[PDB]
Design a protein around this ligand. Structure first.
Ligand SMILES: CCCCCCCCCCCCCCCCCC(=O)OC[C@H](COP(=O)([O-])OCC(O)COP(=O)([O-])OC[C@@H](COC(=O)CCCCCCCCCCCCCCCCC)OC(=O)CCCCCCCCCCCCCCCCC)OC(=O)CCCCCCCCCCCCCCCCC
Ligand SMILES: CCCCCCCCCCCCCCCCCC(=O)OC[C@H](COP(=O)([O-])OCC[N+](C)(C)C)OC(=O)CCCCCCCCCCCCCCCCC
Ligand SMILES: CCCCCCCC/C=C\CCCCCCCC(=O)OC[C@H](COP(=O)(O)OCCN)OC(=O)CCCCCCC/C=C\CCCCCCCC
Ligand SMILES: CCCCCCCC/C=C\CCCCCCCC(=O)O[C@H](COC(=O)CCCCCCC/C=C/CCCCCCCC)COP(=O)(O)OCCN
Ligand SMILES: NC(=O)C1=CN([C@@H]2O[C@H](COP(=O)(O)OP(=O)(O)OC[C@H]3O[C@@H](n4cnc5c(N)ncnc54)[C@H](OP(=O)(O)O)[C@@H]3O)[C@@H](O)[C@H]2O)C=CC1
Ligand SMILES: CN(C)C(=N)NC(=N)N
Ligand code: SF4
Ligand code: SF4
Ligand SMILES: [Zn+2]
Lengths: 112, 124, 208, 114, 96, 97, 48, 341, 376, 176
């Protein structure tokens, strides 16, 4: 409906609601493979359900951009894609495990 | 992870000239308190410094010349062990001086007015 | 009022502390410490091999969109076992915030290159390598950036002399610029400035 | 202890990388002498390459050897791309430095240096 | 008050003059030696001694904030004048 | 400036503006090179009482950074480094060039 | 001086043809001005 | 020693070598090399010059601040000579010309000026005098140049008995005459040689070896009143030497015989030039003359210098004379000439 | 090379005149400023920041001063802050004149260079009147500013600012709608917003790509939250849009200068704390405490509490930042300088993809790199 | 707030299309630029007639250095080395000893003008107004050694420039 997003290389999406629903559902599906006790899973599941509920309750694009506070709907879609990629990588990295190793005795002491 | 049992040696990587690696003896020490002041804040950390080399007088202007790159180089360490490890891995010779701390002293104001001892002061 | 004293912002201090706890909970495997300095700067100390996971999280997460790499540098502290301290300064445009991530390494231990996360890391890591000797593992093109061709040594290390070891002049016999050992007409006069009296009691270290 | 291997897990792999770098440097000396229009011989260039390789022959750490071959590869690519000038290539030879005395009596006559 | 060395070279207010056998005199050949003719020691000796009737005087060098830090001089020793050591100015008490 | 009336008219016509209104050469409209002496103010700390340095010491109020979390040492809501930045408003003075 | 000219060109100097012992008919330096006229010409003050 | 003449430093640019040297004829080939070596070791150098000061600019970077001093001198002016040698303990004599101008002859530049320098230096208290002569300095020589060299060598020895007289053979370098004289004959068609260059034997010496020997003669305490011969390692016939020069320059070598009288006429034709002549009759005589063998005189080995063969440094000089087709050819691409040893 | 700004060695692979890759070689103006700053004290290291970006000098000074004041935990007085903002905008005008006119000179136009450099000369006169130095003023210092303004400076700045919009108009008459200028600058060096953010661009690069970001608005410093101005935003992300953004930023700088002239307050110009800023000469020559503090400040300096800070400002070339590390001494332990042009020159190779030699010249101009700050 | 620098679309009426076509075929904006350059041609040049005319300067200007004296002729410098301490460029070398009358005076005072960055810190740090940076800026030399001033040269500079130096310090000392 709008001619430009104002950002070079960011194209206008004709179907923002469908794309956002697809992306948020895919994100939630990827999060199901993460351990339940992982702090990453709970937080991003919480914010994804929060954002997914808004996209299913507001059919107006401007009002949806206002409610999400993510800039523009194309920026929101791009951020959802980035979050999905991060979720896959985190599933690969598994950062919920305990600390790899402690630093040496005085590694952050300052001044020294 | 691999296991290698060697003493750390990075002389080939630091890029220092061979003469300035091999003919240099550093001095690891805690600086002595400047006798002109009573503060003790400059005697907290260990210092590493090199041996003094030749300085001559410039024919023009009479300034002080030098050919020693490591003349002004002073390194600060929190521990003798840290300083020694740094010197060892950089390959310099080193001489270590044990830190000197003032010994505890018994001060008594009332000693200035002894009835029979020599500590009685003649003036205030 | 106190005209000559910088005012503080407890709201921003609280927000930064909350986000530091958030990150430390999300990434327990790598985050070793979180601090907030009293002029409201968040600082996250991580294990050196969590560079790519932590940076990718701070870039791609919805609640941490640190899309911009303001800077990347290192600090040389010879007294430490891991002397070199790699510092990442990130800027979040979405939340108008800035964060700092700190890593440690020594001469012989590589750090994974972050050019796959930020493209500015390319020249930033080239400069770190050139000036400190820190090697970055999967770097597209790791070579000297600032020093002269064939320059030996890494000048920003604390043990490197200020004027270096060699200096250039033109020699008429060979008709080219030559490199000869450094030799100063007036030697740099080193000043001892530190006062023997303690300035800030709040930073006093235990006598140990 | 269990230290992170940079490129080589053992000294034999490091020796292999050293040999590869030596082959690369050896095969580039004719091209360097031709392109830079140096007045030295190809034999002199190869002798300098051997001498520069041989002053690190005391190293027994695979990580230090890996770093040495990394820096050697970087300075080989500076030569091939003609990023260096004739100035630097000839800086490898110290053609202008006076012969420094090495015996005790000569050093004693010259000055205070150890 | 300039003075000439036995080699013909002017002597500076610090007493500097190259020796007869010093090679460094070659730099002045076909050129000159930069010497300032006015000697501050001579001029400040030419200055007279002020007499004030107080034990302690103050000198700021003249001009106020355009002089030197203000100092106080004790004029009690009758065998010598009190000298402001920033500007070298002598003060005394009226004797006899 | 010093110019003939013909030349000024031709300059105005060629550039399409009144150059005499906005001249790039300075003619006696600038300040005099000699000015009366100033007398500058002192500041807030130039009082003779109630002025102790310990009550106006900025450097001594600096603190080491607070350790939020250290490894050595309910449903929490997800947080952000700060509230999201508000959308900018288009200028009322001149929204478009 | 000519105050009707624009700033920078309102004061000028015609140098002498013989200063000290140099024939300055053609070779004229900017350092030939004594300090007081130097200050006046460079406009550090309005008083000649 | 004066306290300012005691050596200090490491023999670098900012050191003190304890040498105060007045170098006459420093605005030339050997002069620029000697001044470079002195300033490089960190000495005080005085450069008397008679030319335009623009022609002394290449000597400015040769030493640190204040170490090179330029003073104007006249060859026929003992007052200026004293002014320039007054404060120096070493005086080096490199003044000479390969042709006779209107105001100066071979007798003037090789006998009168060297004698004045040696005489004034002795009066002024100069400790060391170095005087550059020629190897073929023969009183009965066919060349007026070399006859003047012999006479001036005798006069210098008489005036300053503690002198070091150095006799180079034929110096070759970037700015030389020798290799450039032979390599610039490509413009005049073929190469004219007397007896086809088969009756001439020459052993040239390298300029850096000559300058290093001059410097070592200053520092040697047992070379005070001596005579040296600076020669190269290899002796060559003139034909072989010129053929090698043309081979290195990659120029077509077409030698032809030219009788001595005709070559003298040609040399007389070229010496009418008001400017620097291309060749002269005395130059032709010197070129045809074989280099003398003087086994009794000391040499570069005795001064500690290993003489550099021509085959190692010829490409420095002769690469400028190549064409673009042959500029990049390497040093070892030309087989060395046959020697006569 | 005329278009290489003196110390850039661009090793380019060309197929004909088409650029296949750009390989910038920097370090030809690398001096070792950070090592030297380690060896200096905090007052002695200020001229180093004067000489980094030698076109925005008081801006570099302001960034350093803000960092050191943040670590010291002090506050400059309001008059000092307003003087800082006023001269930062004057410096922005100087820098933008330089950037636009040098860009146009590389393209082929020279008369705007001459006109706007006469304007630069007048602004240099302002610099010299406050400081005594035409460009390297060393005027803005940690704790305020060195001296107070002379008694005609505000009137003269008002005259200059009154007559400058006509100069900008004349500059725009030669370039903005010129078809040759548009052919040279339109659709040259286009960079997307995501690519700009990842590559680390800042300032007019982002704003030409269309990103609504400005440090003066989002993270204000000094008294930038008390002035009104607009932030120009580009759409096509190319050389022409960045040129328009820089010209409109010149006009907004005129706005800010007018507001500063009107809102200049009275009072002292440096922090009233003799342990950080020097006392007056009269107090030094009268008071014992003042003489002691003058002596100690000018010989040893002030000690900064230990800590590391990263402070950035919106310099005319983008975000200029300092990461300063203090160990509690009077000399900085570490000082990393983040120059905006470093990341831009790093991104030069991507921007010049599929272009020609003249296009690469134009792209260098539109990036507006100073190698003093690139190399340091 | 923000504004768009290039976001307008042209009007597509026949009059506007014809006007743009005329601008394309008849080089209207090019002639407009020609007119601007011609206007500048008939304006007055801004060039001063150096060396007979000099640009404006101020009392605060920092040029060549000088060592001052008291009105009595005594040197102001007391060899306190504050200028040497504060000098960013390490361009000052000072050596002192008691004078024959016991004064604290310098025997060596050097400034390397090839090392000096002309920052004016030495005259801020001087407690007695001895070292100043005078108004002279035309002192270029032909050799490097002539730029290494010593005490005699600096005192000569002070004696030559004292009148102007005094006037400038008088004009600007109330701002200090
Ligand atoms: C030669 C004819 C006689 C000329 C006058 C006599 C001068 C002496 C003889 C000429 C020597 C050169 C003079 C140069 C300057 C003299 C010194 C000076 O600056 O005095 C201050 C004084 C200016 O007063 P001011 O107070 O500084 O001005 C007020 C403002 O500062 C500025 O106010 P403004 O910005 O409003 O400007 C004022 C403007 C206002 O004027 C107007 O409004 C009048 C109309 C416009 C000017 C018309 C010019 C000519 C037509 C256009 C040509 C293109 O007036 C002028 O510009 C004066 C123009 C006078 C023209 C007279 C006829 C000259 C014809 C030359 C043609 C050349 C090309 C053709 C081929 C020739 C082949 C031989 O000078 C004059 O008034 C004299 C006129 C200056 C230019 C004359 C050039 C003539 C040609 C030179 C060679 C002649 C000899 C033949 C050579 C043959 C081949 C070898
Ligand atoms: C080729 C052109 C023919 C037609 C010419 C028509 C007239 C030209 C008018 C313009 C003159 C341009 C010159 C201006 C400068 C004046 C000075 C000048 O010319 O100097 C030249 C040269 C100058 O030598 P130079 O190279 O040192 O000059 C450099 C320039 N100076 C020094 C002036 C700064 O003068 C001479 O050569 C004259 C000296 C005597 C030389 C005798 C040469 C004999 C003949 C040459 C061939 C010999 C071998 C033949 C082999 C075969 C035999 C069968
Ligand atoms: C046949 C046509 C004759 C050609 C006419 C002359 C062509 C131009 C010659 C020329 O320009 O070069 C001559 C060349 C230039 O010297 P430069 O390199 O400039 O040295 C100066 C360094 N500052 O001069 C020389 O050095 C050559 C001297 C050797 C000449 C030997 C004389 C014998 C030649 C004559 C043979 C003919 C006999 C019949
Ligand atoms: C009765 C029936 C008669 C039939 C004849 C009708 C013809 C009359 C109407 C048509 C005339 C049209 C004019 C022809 C010239 C037009 C040239 C042109 O093509 O215009 C420009 C091209 O011209 C230029 O751009 C000029 C660039 C160089 C300008 C620099 C110098 C010009 C300024 C000096 C003015 C010249 C004055 C000429 C004086 C001549 C004196 C002899 C268009 O190019 P672009 O804008 O880039 O777009 C095209 C693709 N979209
Ligand atoms: N190079 C050789 O082939 C050999 C040379 N020699 C001898 O070595 C010495 C140096 O040789 P070289 O470098 O080739 O010669 P150059 O011709 O290149 O240099 C001669 C020097 O002497 C100066 N000079 C010449 N005539 C006079 C004069 N009348 N008055 C004052 N100064 C004068 C010249 O100065 P300016 O330019 O100012 O006039 C120049 O500095 C000469 O004595 C030469 O005979 C000995 C054996 C071999
Ligand atoms: C050399 N400098 C400083 C430039 N600005 N150069 C340039 N070509 N624009
Ligand atoms: S102006 Fe600055 S650099 Fe020059 S001598 Fe004074 S303090 Fe040093
Ligand atoms: S600060 Fe002034 S009084 Fe002190 S040593 Fe320097 S010039 Fe002399
Ligand atoms: Zn006094």
């Amino acid at each position: 409906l709008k001619k430009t997003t104002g950002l070079v290389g960011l194209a206008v999406c004709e179907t923002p609601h469908e794309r956002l629903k697809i992306l948020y559902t895919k994100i939630l599906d990827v999060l199901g493979q993460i351990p339940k006790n992982a702090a990453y899973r709970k937080y991003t599941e919480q914010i994804t359900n929060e954002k997914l509920g808004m996209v299913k309750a507001e059919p107006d694009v401007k009002k949806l951009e206002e409610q999400l506070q993510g800039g523009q709907i194309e920026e929101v879609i791009l951020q959802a894609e980035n979050e999905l990629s991060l979720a896959r990588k985190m599933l690969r990295w598994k950062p919920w495990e305990p600390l790899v190793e402690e630093p040496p005795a005085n590694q952050w002491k300052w001044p020294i | 992870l691999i296991a290698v049992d060697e003493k750390l040696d990075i002389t080939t990587l630091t890029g220092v000239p061979e003469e300035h690696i091999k003919t240099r003896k550093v001095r690891i020490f805690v600086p002595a308190r400047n006798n002109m002041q009573s503060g003790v804040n400059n005697t907290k950390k260990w210092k590493m410094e090199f041996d003094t080399r030749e300085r001559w007088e410039n024919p023009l202007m009479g300034w002080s010349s030098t050919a020693d790159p490591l003349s002004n180089l002073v390194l600060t360490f929190s521990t003798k062990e840290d300083a020694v490890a740094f010197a060892e891995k950089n390959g310099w010779s080193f001489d270590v001086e044990e830190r000197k701390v003032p010994k505890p002293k018994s001060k008594s104001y009332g000693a200035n007015f002894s009835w029979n001892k020599r500590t009685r002061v003649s003036t205030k | 009022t106190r005209p000559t004293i910088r005012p503080r912002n407890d709201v921003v201090h609280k927000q930064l502390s909350a986000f530091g706890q958030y990150v430390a909970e999300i990434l327990p495997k790598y985050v070793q410490q979180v601090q907030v300095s009293c002029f409201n700067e968040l600082e996250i100390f991580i294990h050196p091999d969590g560079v790519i996971p932590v940076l990718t999280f701070l870039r791609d997460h919805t609640n941490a969109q640190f899309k911009s790499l303001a800077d990347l540098t290192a600090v040389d502290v010879p007294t430490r076992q891991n002397r070199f301290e790699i510092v990442y300064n990130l800027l979040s445009l979405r939340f108008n915030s800035r964060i700092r991530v700190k890593t440690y390494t020594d001469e012989l231990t590589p750090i994974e290159s972050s050019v796959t996360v930020y493209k500015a890391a390319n020249w930033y890591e080239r400069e770190i390598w050139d000036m400190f000797g820190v090697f970055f593992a999967n770097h597209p093109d790791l070579r000297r950036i600032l020093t002269d061709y064939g320059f030996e040594g890494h000048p920003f290390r604390k043990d490197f002399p200020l004027s270096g070891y060699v200096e250039l002049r033109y020699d008429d016999e060979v008709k080219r610029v030559v490199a000869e050992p450094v030799e100063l007409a007036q030697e740099f006069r080193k000043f001892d400035l530190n006062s023997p009296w303690e300035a800030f009691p709040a930073y006093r270290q235990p006598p140990e | 202890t269990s230290v992170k291997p940079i490129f080589s897990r053992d000294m034999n792999e490091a020796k292999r990388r050293v040999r590869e770098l030596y082959r690369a440097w050896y095969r580039e000396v004719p091209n360097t002498v031709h392109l830079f229009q140096l007045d030295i011989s190809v034999k002199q260039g190869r002798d300098k390459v051997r001498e520069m390789f041989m002053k690190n022959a005391h190293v027994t750490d695979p990580r230090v050897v890996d770093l040495l071959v990394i820096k050697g590869k970087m300075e080989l690519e500076e030569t091939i791309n003609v990023w260096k000038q004739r100035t630097h290539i000839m800086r490898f030879f110290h053609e202008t430095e006076a012969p420094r005395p090495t015996d005790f009596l000569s050093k004693f006559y010259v000055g205070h240096d150890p | 008050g300039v003075r000439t060395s036995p080699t013909g070279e002017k002597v500076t207010h610090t007493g500097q003059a190259y020796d007869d056998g010093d090679y460094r005199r070659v730099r002045f050949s076909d050129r000159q030696k930069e010497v300032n003719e006015n000697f501050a020691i001579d001029l400040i000796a030419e200055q007279p001694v002020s007499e004030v009737g107080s034990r302690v005087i103050s000198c700021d060098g003249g001009g106020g904030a355009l002089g030197h830090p203000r100092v106080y001089i004790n004029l009690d020793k009758e065998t010598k004048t009190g000298t402001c050591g920033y500007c070298g100015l002598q003060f005394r008490q009226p004797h006899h | 400036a010093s110019a003939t009336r013909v030349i000024q008219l031709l300059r105005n016509w060629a550039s399409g503006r009144d150059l005499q209104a906005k001249l790039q050469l300075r003619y006696q409209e600038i300040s005099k090179r000699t000015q009366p002496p100033p007398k500058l103010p002192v500041g807030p700390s130039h009082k003779l009482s109630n002025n102790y340095y310990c009550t106006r010491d900025g450097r001594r109020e600096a603190m080491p950074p607070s350790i939020v979390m250290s490894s050595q040492k309910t449903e929490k809501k997800a947080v952000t480094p700060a509230p999201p930045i508000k959308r900018w408003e288009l200028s009322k003075d001149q929204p478009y060039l | 001086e000519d105050n009707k000219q624009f700033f920078g060109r309102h004061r000028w100097v015609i140098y002498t043809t013989e200063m000290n012992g140099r024939d300055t008919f053609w070779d004229v330096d900017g350092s030939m001005v004594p300090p007081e006229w130097h200050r006046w010409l460079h406009c550090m003050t309005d008083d000649p | 020693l004066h306290h300012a003449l005691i050596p200090h430093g490491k023999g670098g640019r900012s050191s003190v070598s304890g040498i105060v040297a007045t170098v006459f004829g420093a605005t030339g080939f050997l002069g620029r090399y000697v001044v470079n070596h002195l300033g490089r070791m960190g000495s005080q150098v005085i450069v008397p010059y008679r030319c335009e000061p623009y022609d002394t600019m290449h000597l400015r970077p040769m030493g640190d601040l204040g170490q090179i001093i330029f003073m104007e001198w006249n060859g026929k002016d003992k007052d200026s000579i004293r002014k320039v040698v007054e404060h120096s303990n070493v005086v080096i004599n490199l003044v000479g010309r390969e042709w006779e101008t209107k105001n100066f002859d071979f007798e003037d530049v090789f006998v009168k000026i060297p004698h004045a320098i040696a005489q004034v230096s002795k009066e002024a208290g100069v400790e060391k005098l170095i005087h550059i002569s020629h190897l073929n300095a023969d009183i009965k020589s066919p060349s007026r140049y070399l006859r003047s060299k012999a006479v001036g060598e005798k006069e210098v020895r008489a005036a300053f008995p503690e002198a070091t007289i150095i006799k180079p053979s034929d110096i070759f370098g970037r700015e030389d005459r020798f290799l450039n004289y032979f390599a610039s004959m490509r413009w005049f068609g073929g190469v004219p040689l007397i007896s086809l260059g088969k009756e001439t034997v020459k052993q040239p010496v390298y300029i850096v070896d000559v300058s290093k020997g001059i410097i070592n003669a200053i520092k040697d305490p047992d070379a005070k009143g001596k005579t040296f011969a600076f020669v190269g390692p290899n002796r060559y016939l003139l034909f072989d030497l010129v053929q090698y020069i043309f081979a290195v320059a990659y120029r077509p070598f077409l030698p032809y015989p030219l009788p001595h009288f005709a070559y003298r006429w040609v040399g007389r034709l070229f010496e009418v030039s008001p400017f620097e002549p291309w060749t002269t009759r005395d130059k032709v005589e010197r070129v045809h003359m074989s280099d003398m063998t003087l086994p009794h005189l000391p040499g570069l080995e005795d001064l500690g210098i290993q003489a550099t063969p021509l085959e190692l440094k010829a490409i420095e000089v002769l690469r400028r004379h190549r064409t673009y087709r042959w500029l990049t050819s390497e040093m070892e691409d030309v087989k060395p000439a046959k020697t006569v040893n | 090379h005329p278009a290489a700004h003196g110390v850039l060695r661009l090793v380019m692979e060309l197929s004909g005149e088409m650029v296949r890759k750009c390989d910038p070689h920097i370090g030809l103006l690398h001096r070792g400023t950070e090592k030297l700053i380690e060896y200096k004290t905090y007052l002695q290291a200020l001229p180093y920041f004067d000489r980094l970006d030698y076109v925005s000098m008081m801006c570099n000074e302001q960034a350093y001063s803000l960092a050191v004041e943040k670590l010291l935990n002090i506050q400059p007085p309001p008059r000092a802050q307003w003087i800082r903002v006023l001269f930062g905008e004057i410096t922005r005008l100087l820098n933008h004149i330089m950037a636009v006119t040098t860009h146009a000179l590389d393209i082929g136009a020279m008369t705007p260079f001459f006109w706007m450099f006469e304007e630069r000369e007048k602004m240099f006169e302002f610099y010299e009147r406050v400081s005594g130095a035409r460009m390297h003023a060393a005027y803005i210092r940690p704790g305020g500013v060195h001296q107070d303004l002379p008694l005609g400076l505000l009137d003269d700045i008002y005259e200059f600012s009154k007559n400058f919009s006509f100069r900008i108009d004349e500059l725009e008459e030669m370039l903005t709608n010129n078809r040759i200028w548009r052919n040279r600058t339109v659709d040259i060096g286009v960079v997307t917003a995501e690519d700009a953010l990842n590559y680390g661009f800042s300032g007019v690069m982002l704003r030409g790509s269309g990103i609504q970001w400005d440090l003066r608005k989002t993270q204000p410093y000094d008294v930038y939250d008390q002035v009104e101005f607009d932030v120009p935003i580009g759409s096509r992300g190319d050389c022409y849009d960045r040129y328009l953004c820089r010209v409109e930023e010149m006009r907004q700088s005129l706005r800010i200068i007018s507001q500063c002239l009107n809102k200049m307050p009275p009072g002292e110009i440096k922090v009233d704390d003799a342990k950080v800023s020097p006392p007056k000469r009269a107090e030094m020559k009268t008071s014992m405490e003042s003489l002691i503090h003058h002596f100690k400040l000018y010989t040893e300096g002030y000690q900064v509490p230990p800590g590391a800070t990263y402070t950035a400002i919106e310099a005319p070339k983008g975000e200029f930042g300092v990461y300063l590390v203090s160990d509690g001494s009077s000399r900085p332990y570490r000082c990393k300088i983040k120059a905006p042009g470093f990341a831009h020159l790093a991104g030069l190779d991507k921007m010049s993809k599929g272009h020609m030699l003249a296009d690469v010249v134009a792209i260098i101009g539109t990036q507006d790199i100073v190698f003093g700050e690139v190399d340091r | 707030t923000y504004k768009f620098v290039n976001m307008r679309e042209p009007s597509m009426d026949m009059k506007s299309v014809t006007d743009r076509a005329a601008q394309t075929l008849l080089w209207t904006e090019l002639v407009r630029g020609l007119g601007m350059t011609l206007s500048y041609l008939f304006r007055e040049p801004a060039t001063i007639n150096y060396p007979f005319e000099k640009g404006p300067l101020s009392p605060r200007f920092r040029g060549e250095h000088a060592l001052r004296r008291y009105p009595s002729g005594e040197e102001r410098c007391i060899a306190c080395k504050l200028c040497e301490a504060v000098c960013p460029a390490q361009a000052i070398t000072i050596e002192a000893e008691p004078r024959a009358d016991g004064s604290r005076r310098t025997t060596r005072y050097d400034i390397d003008m090839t090392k000096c960055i002309y920052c004016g810190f030495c005259q801020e740090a001087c407690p007695v107004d001895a070292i100043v940076e005078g108004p002279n800026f035309e002192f270029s030399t032909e050799t490097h050694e002539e730029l290494l001033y010593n005490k005699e040269k600096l005192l000569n500079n002070g004696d030559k420039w004292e009148a102007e130096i005094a006037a400038n310090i008088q004009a600007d000392y109330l701002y200090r």
